[PDB]
Ligand binder design. Structure first.
Ligand SMILES: Nc1nc2c(ncn2[C@@H]2O[C@H](COP(=O)(O)OP(=O)(O)OP(=O)(O)O)[C@@H](O)[C@H]2O)c(=O)[nH]1
Ligand SMILES: Nc1nc2c(ncn2[C@@H]2O[C@H](COP(=O)(O)OP(=O)(O)OP(=O)(O)O)[C@@H](O)[C@H]2O)c(=O)[nH]1
Ligand SMILES: Nc1nc2c(ncn2[C@@H]2O[C@H](COP(=O)(O)OP(=O)(O)O)[C@@H](O)[C@H]2O)c(=O)[nH]1
Ligand SMILES: [Mg+2]
Ligand SMILES: [Mg+2]
Lengths: 58, 434, 105, 430, 439
């Protein structure tokens, strides 16, 4: 019984692009950033803080 | 409606800030060239300032008397982002002479920098505060960093301070003259800042080594983790959350005494994707992970002394019930003990946005984490080690002349060890029972 | 300092090796009329005080034996330097007594 | 931007100079004709440091070649790389020095100092902010030590603030190339102590020992000795021309290499070196680099650093390496070599990082360290004078310039105690 | 009103005694000159220092100690020592010629001319004391001067005072390495005189100290001072209850009635741990059994002897600090249950427990140091008779050739006395063999 096969032996990696489940979700380096979804402080009333009407109070 | 102006000085400060801003930049979708792709949201104002045409100019200040490091950015890809005339670069460097960087060569530029900073505050009105990064074991930062620190206190006065310092490595140092310029920098910043941090570079390596298992890391990655530290700091400032912690709510919950404003900070978890597959990464387990001294960001073991304060900002998908269930667990362990007079020192905050990973980063994507800024009397050792060094090279007047000839008087050196000597007793006196 | 220097006063003495063209150093002692010549650069010379052959020690065993050798422990600020050894003197775990309860009990 | 100048004098001082510009011309990607052909855009950003802008797009070194004999300067320009130097900057007379320290400082050399002082001032005034002068010369030679020093002495009276360098090839007693080798060096040496901020001592014996032993070369020629010394030059300013993680101008080194104001004599070494027949058989990486650089024999000083203790030391690693590995090796070398990084100044080793490796090599370092081991060189080398002084003479070739005895008996009075300054800061302890 | 007088003879006692007193004055806050600083908190609380010192009425303190040695060099060091004022100048009796390890000189030729001043000395010293519990004698058997001065002196106190309890902490020569070449002779004869005139003998062979030192101390380059800071801390807890409050008082008197089952069997050995130091102080906890278990460890005994080779007759242990003793029974409870630890058939109970409250104090910083635990035993094991074998056999190994015989015969000591030491010493083994035999 000869050694089964050199090509089927334990290879520290094989030819399966993503050889493991590891890199399937690893971020792409060159990918453009994605704007965050609707997750932040909702904004109405401080509108009346930066407006140019506050000064000149008297 | 809240914005913070950043002051990055010293070769580290611009470099260390280098890594952090992308995380600030990337998390808002702004392109490197100063544009956002068509898609709360878009309120980058927390760090940026919209001109009205699309560009987002960060409210950061770049200073260094040595053009080299500064030259690395305006020639880099990020050239188009920052305001051009807002980058102040000096001609002659301080060459690690604190006196030079604090007495002679920095004064002629102070007006320009003081001019720029003042301008950046006009646009905003609800400015929470300023974050200044300066390396104590650095020449240009030691002096220039202090001088700006001194001025604002008379430039604005009461306005708070949040400065991230990087003290010298506990044992493996780069320069030799660090003990001198380190002490004086402490003296100026000891009573002219509000909150400090312990950013010894030795801490990251073990964290980078033990966790990332990168036996050959460089300074670029170390900043990345530090950058992560800041991100969780302002997390409650530009994201919706049930419990929010702001800068103005810092002296109230982290300052047992006006003098004592030097604590240590940490973050977790530092895990690569290769080991997080077989990990639960449960909120409970991560809770203890940021308490073991192995994962701390300062080369100090809290088991040496008591604990005076612990403030927690939770970021991710944690739930308050587990935190309290997890928080209580810490009150049971006997290896970590508080002070006799600290009944309540816990601060727990929950923000809905989990960590964001920049492309090419080392940290993997997780579901929970923690960052910490805790008050413990353990800070005594770090200064104590310096105390031993300071006298050793002055009992024979080593290197004294180099300092004397640049305008620093001989009597300035003694007070530094005088102020430090008082400081050490200040921490010890607040660690015993009544 | 120390370093060296030249000699530079030729037409002085010895009356014969004076101005004998030959690289002959400076002049010839002839004080005794015998052997060794003047042994171009020196050394700033030395005296008995400069070289005293420092004694190996200055003190005795008992002075160090009963030195006035604070009690170091966890933290407690300064820790005196000592040779490194991993089987442990003051960085390892303690053990706290099981002492008594007073009175008749 | 913070550019510098070079003043090399004497045939010895000139020959070393002949290659450094040969060495520098390569790093910035410049061939002999004076035209730019480099490869990397970083190659040219920091080019102003050593050249001045000129018409036709050609660059010329900011160099002043100073000599008192005609052959030397006549020699260089007709050889390869003979076009770089500005013809005007040359200066020479019609007399020569003749390794007579007297003639080179009072009669002939004195009269011509006007021109060299004339040229030197102009070029320095041109630069936007003069970083400093680096002076290379041979104290064993006449014009270098004799007349060359005075220029070092005089220039202090005009520019008190800028810092100085000296790549002085002090001769060693083992193999002396001149009988005067030990009335020109020190008399230039004595004046050197009071003005020279720093001093590099390169001993000939080290070069021959360096060439024969590690390089495994059979029949080297002075071209072999010259370049190895020149390579050291690029290390001093290497980080001054390219960006890097940790930069340190020539000022920053000055702060962290001289324990006391006057003790400013160092010993340097260059690594790594391997023979032509040995390159493949060696795995070059960061940790075996330290073995070579810290080895005593690698030093270019005849003194053995094992005769004393190191006061302070700095190293500029060349080649792109991370930050972690650089520090750690320092910790072990300090602890393992604690006996020498003596004991009253903790961690007396400075660190630098640069990311431009020498063309054709992936890791190399430059060494600049201060150790009392330099004491032997100022004790033994020509120590014969102390016994050979007693007989007063050789004078007739030096009083021909008005030099008197008092100028000599006074020097040890000023000069008696260098080691008596260096020796004391070797046994002291807290 | 209880006072104890410590008698030191021989350099080993000259040095070893030094460590205890220096720690004492450091334990009681006594300055090198003996002047108690009033700036310290409170002061003059009852009479705690009265055990070892003697008040002069106004000022310094006078410890009740005596120094003896035939060679001036050892004495001269103390008088010029930094504590040259802590001891009474008239108490430093010194001779003119050393014994140089021979018994006949320090006991029959030149040792008889010195016993007069000291004996008078103690009488004056004993006169001050009113509740004298006894006397402490420190000396090394590995010298004719010691054994010579120990043998001749000790017997005197037997008749001069009578029933006064006397404790002797002998330091026998090592099994393999001994400072002198005639170590067996002085020890062989020395036990004779002290055979019926010493109350307690604590086996403290030096090499065992290093083994503990080489296993816990971890000082590859130890000096005697390293040994000194070990023993000196030992005495502090031994008489601990004699100078501090305790739940169940343990005094010097109630020891012979607890450690002397038979008139001849009075040799004892002690154990104590842990150690405080400079590369094991994460100070953090462990528990008692560890301190007790290490107490009974074969290698933790102050003798190079294995109790696995013998049985246990009686025991005594000492603690300090503040906790509830309740762990003691259970901690001891795990002791007897161990099969490696055995008791004799006729010993229903063989443990004596005495615990005080005062923690351990260490010179800064010691060689031991301010330990958190403090466990020390006062117990006896038959195995030490063996490892008498080392002394017995080697001593036999010499006389057969009569080697070095004439040296002792040159002082008028007859050739015949050598027989008796073998006789009495030989008879010594018989009882131990019979003592351990079950009925
Ligand atoms: N943690 C960390 N520290 C850095 C980094 N870069 C520089 N440093 C610090 O910088 C110190 C070295 O001195 P320099 O960086 O040259 O100090 P400097 O900012 O140049 O100040 P000047 O010399 O006056 O210009 C080291 O001890 C480090 O603590 C970095 O990337 N990460
Ligand atoms: N463990 C220990 N033993 C000591 C110390 N100092 C002395 N000794 C003992 O003293 C012995 C040396 O014997 P000797 O030098 O003859 O002392 P002696 O018995 O008084 O006889 P003489 O010196 O002649 O007076 C050694 O075997 C030690 O056991 C010490 O500091 N530590
Ligand atoms: N290493 C080295 N040494 C040199 C070189 N040229 C001359 N020397 C040394 O310079 C010494 C002679 O100097 P000298 O000719 O008097 O200098 P000059 O008077 O200016 O011409 C000799 O001992 C040589 O060792 C060189 O190219 N390389
Ligand atoms: Mg800098
Ligand atoms: Mg003796």
């Amino acid at each position: 019984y000869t050694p089964d096969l050199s090509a089927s032996a334990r290879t520290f990696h094989k030819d399966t692009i993503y050889e493991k489940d590891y890199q399937k979700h690893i971020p792409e380096l060159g990918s453009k950033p994605t704007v965050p979804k609707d997750k932040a402080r909702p904004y109405n009333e401080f509108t009346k803080t930066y407006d140019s009407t506050h000064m000149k109070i008297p | 409606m809240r914005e913070v102006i950043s002051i990055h000085v010293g070769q580290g400060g611009i470099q260390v800030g280098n890594a952090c801003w992308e995380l600030f930049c990337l998390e808002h979708g702004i392109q490197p060239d100063g544009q956002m792709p068509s898609d709360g949201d878009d309120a980058f104002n927390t760090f940026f300032s919209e001109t009205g045409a699309g560009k987002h100019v960060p409210r950061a200040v770049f200073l260094d008397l040595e053009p080299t490091v500064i030259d690395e950015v305006r020639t880099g890809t990020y050239r188009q982002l920052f305001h051009p005339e807002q980058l102040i670069s000096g001609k002659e460097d301080a060459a690690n002479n604190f006196a030079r960087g604090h007495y002679t060569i920095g004064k002629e530029i102070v007006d320009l920098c003081l001019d720029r900073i003042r301008k950046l505050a006009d646009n905003c009105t609800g400015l929470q505060g300023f974050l200044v990064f300066n390396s104590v074991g650095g020449g240009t930062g030691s002096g220039l960093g202090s001088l700006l620190l001194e001025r604002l206190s008379v430039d604005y006065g009461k306005k708070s301070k949040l400065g991230f310092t990087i003290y010298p490595s506990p044992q493996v140092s780069t320069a030799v003259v660090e003990p001198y310029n380190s002490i004086l920098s402490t003296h100026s910043l000891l009573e002219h800042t509000d909150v400090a941090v312990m950013l010894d570079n030795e801490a990251i390596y073990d964290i980078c080594r033990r966790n990332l298992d990168i036996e050959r890391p460089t300074y670029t990655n170390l900043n990345r983790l530090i950058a992560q530290v800041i991100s969780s700091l302002t997390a409650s400032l530009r994201f919706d959350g049930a419990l929010n912690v702001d800068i103005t709510e810092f002296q109230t919950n982290l300052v047992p005494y006006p003098r004592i404003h030097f604590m240590l900070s940490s973050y977790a978890p530092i895990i690569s994707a290769e080991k997080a597959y077989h990990e639960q990464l449960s909120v409970a387990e991560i809770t203890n992970s940021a308490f073991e001294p192995a994962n701390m960001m300062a080369k100090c073991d809290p088991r040496h002394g008591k604990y005076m304060a612990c403030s927690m900002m939770y970021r991710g998908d944690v739930v308050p019930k587990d935190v309290n269930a997890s928080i209580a667990t810490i009150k049971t362990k006997r290896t970590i003990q508080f002070v006799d007079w600290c009944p309540t020192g816990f601060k727990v905050g929950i923000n809905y946005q989990p960590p964001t990973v920049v492309p090419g980063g080392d940290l993997a994507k997780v579901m929970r984490a923690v960052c910490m800024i805790s008050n413990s009397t353990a800070i005594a050792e770090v200064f104590s080690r310096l105390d031993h060094k300071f006298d050793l090279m002055y009992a024979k007047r080593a290197f004294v002349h180099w300092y004397v000839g640049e305008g620093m008087e001989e009597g300035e050196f003694s007070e530094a060890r005088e102020d430090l000597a008082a400081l050490e007793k200040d921490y010890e006196e607040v660690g015993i029972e009544t | 300092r120390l370093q060296y220097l030249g000699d530079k006063k030729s037409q002085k003495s010895a009356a014969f090796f004076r101005d004998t063209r030959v690289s002959s150093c400076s002049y010839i002692s002839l004080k005794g009329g015998v052997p060794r010549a003047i042994p171009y650069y020196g050394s700033p010379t030395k005296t008995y005080a400069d070289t005293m052959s420092k004694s190996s020690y200055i003190s005795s065993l008992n002075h160090d034996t009963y030195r006035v050798r604070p009690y170091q422990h966890v933290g407690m600020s300064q820790k005196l330097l000592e040779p490194y050894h991993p089987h442990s003197y003051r960085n390892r775990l303690p053990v706290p007594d099981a002492p008594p309860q007073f009175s008749n009990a | 931007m913070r550019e510098i100048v070079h003043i090399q004098g004497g045939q010895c001082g000139n020959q070393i100079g002949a290659k450094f510009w040969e060495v520098i011309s390569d790093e910035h990607g410049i061939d002999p004709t004076g035209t730019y052909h480099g490869d990397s855009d970083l190659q040219l950003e920091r080019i102003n440091v050593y050249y001045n802008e000129a018409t036709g797009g050609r660059y010329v070194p900011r160099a002043i070649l100073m000599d008192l004999e005609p052959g030397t300067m006549d020699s260089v320009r007709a050889g390869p790389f003979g076009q770089l130097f500005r013809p005007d900057n040359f200066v020479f007379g019609q007399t020569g020095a003749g390794n007579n320290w007297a003639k080179g400082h009072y009669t002939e050399g004195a009269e011509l100092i006007d021109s060299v002082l004339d040229v030197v001032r102009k070029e320095a005034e041109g630069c936007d902010c003069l970083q400093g002068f680096q002076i290379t010369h041979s104290l064993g030679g006449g014009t270098g030590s004799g007349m060359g020093t005075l220029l070092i002495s005089k220039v202090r009276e005009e520019y008190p603030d800028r810092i100085m360098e000296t790549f002085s090839v002090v001769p060693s007693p083992k193999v002396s190339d001149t009988v005067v080798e030990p009335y020109n060096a020190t008399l230039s040496v004595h004046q050197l102590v009071e003005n020279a901020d720093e001093c590099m001592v390169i001993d000939n014996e080290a070069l021959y020992d360096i060439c024969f032993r590690t390089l495994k070369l059979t029949t080297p020629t002075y071209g072999d000795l010259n370049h190895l010394v020149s390579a050291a030059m690029s290390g001093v300013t290497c980080c001054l021309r390219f960006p890097g993680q940790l930069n340190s101008d020539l000022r920053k080194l000055a702060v962290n290499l001289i324990p006391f104001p006057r003790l400013h004599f160092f010993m340097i070494g260059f690594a790594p070196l391997t023979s032509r027949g040995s390159q493949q058989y060696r795995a070059l990486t960061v940790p075996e680099l330290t073995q070579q650089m810290f080895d005593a024999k690698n030093m270019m000083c005849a003194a053995d650093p094992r005769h004393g203790r190191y006061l302070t030391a700095s190293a500029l690693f060349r080649g792109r390496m991370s930050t972690k590995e650089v520090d750690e090796q320092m910790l072990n070398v300090q602890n393992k070599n604690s006996s020498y990084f003596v004991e009253w100044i903790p961690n007396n080793i400075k660190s630098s990082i640069c990311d431009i490796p020498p063309k054709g090599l992936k890791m190399a370092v430059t060494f600049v360290g201060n150790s009392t081991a330099i004491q032997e060189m100022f004790k033994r080398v020509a120590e014969q004078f102390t016994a050979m002084f007693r007989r007063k003479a050789f004078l007739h070739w030096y009083t021909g310039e008005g030099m008197d005895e008092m100028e000599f008996t006074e020097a040890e009075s000023n000069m008696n105690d260098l080691v008596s300054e260096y020796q004391q800061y070797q046994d002291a302890t807290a």
